[PDB]
Amino acid sequence: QDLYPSRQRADAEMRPRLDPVVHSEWTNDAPISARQAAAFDRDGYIVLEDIFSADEVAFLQKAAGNLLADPAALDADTIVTEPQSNEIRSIFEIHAQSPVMARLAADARLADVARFLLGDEVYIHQSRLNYKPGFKGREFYWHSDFETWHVEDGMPRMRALSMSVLLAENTPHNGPLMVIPGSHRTYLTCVGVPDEESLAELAHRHGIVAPTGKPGTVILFDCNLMHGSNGNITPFPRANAFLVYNAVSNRLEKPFGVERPWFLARRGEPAALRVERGPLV
Ligand SMILES: [Fe+3]
């Protein structure tokens, strides 16, 4: 019933993973190589480079800039801010509010990878446009998306993946997203923040890797990969579009816990995203 119980005991447990990581057999029809599929299964993430042209990247950058500079045009429920100061930090449900980001989510070069890896038709569980500025950028502490999606949102199986489309450069120096490769095969229960000893254990066994890339690079990770990021004192901002794909067969149920606002998760009984091909501009 609850295959992945968390926030119930007082102590923390490392339970095994009971879902595949790659939900499809590999063949020459797959949108990715055999080695990339194997890397995903083993590490829980992979990095796609050079899949969008220079113009498409400039287009997506240009577009994100406009969204971020124009909060009057959008649903106030979806905005996240520097409190106080009036600075836009995130925008949820951009895939619904932005015809450009809607088209991004549906691009084959992303959606076909997700349908393969998730071995199913897919829909967006959540989307974000994110801007971490220079000088004053916060850390996001270590967490597993799935642990929250399960407990708070009712996502029942590890059958989803996040896609982070970089829009500003990630150097090693400006708090790029950091992962613990392999951590996706352990479900770490929370007493919802993971605990120091477990975290240390994972990082000692597996190490840390913080993949970088020029704008337009795409970082894909399993829903249960343990990840996070340092702050950023540099003048160089971080900005990405964050897209979470879920298998349609893995639709949300009632939360495995006590309750979460609509813009954080499509609770609905949703339908398959329709893949679009050819360039963006
Ligand atoms: Fe996250």
Swiss-Prot record:
Feature type site, description Important for ectoine stabilization: W149
Annotated residues for binding of 2-oxoglutarate: K132
Enzyme Commission code: 1.14.11.55
Reactions catalysed, as given in the entry: L-ectoine + 2-oxoglutarate + O2 = 5-hydroxyectoine + succinate + CO2
Co-factor remark: Binds 1 Fe(2+) ion.
Binding positions for Fe cation per the UniProt entry: H143, D145, H227
Record annotation: effect of changing T148A: Strong reduction in the production of 5-hydroxyectoine
Chain segments annotated as coiled-coil in the UniProt record: none
Pfam families: PhyH (PF05721)
Single GO term (MF): 2-oxoglutarate-dependent dioxygenase activity
Effect of pH on activity: Optimum pH is 8.
InterPro entries named in the record: EctD, Phytyl_CoA_dOase-like
Subunit structure, as described in the record: Homodimer.
Similarity comment: Belongs to the PhyH family. EctD subfamily.
Listed NCBIfam families: ectoine_ThpD
UniProt-recorded name of the protein: Ectoine dioxygenase
Organism, as annotated: Sphingopyxis alaskensis (strain DSM 13593 / LMG 18877 / RB2256) (Sphingomonas alaskensis)
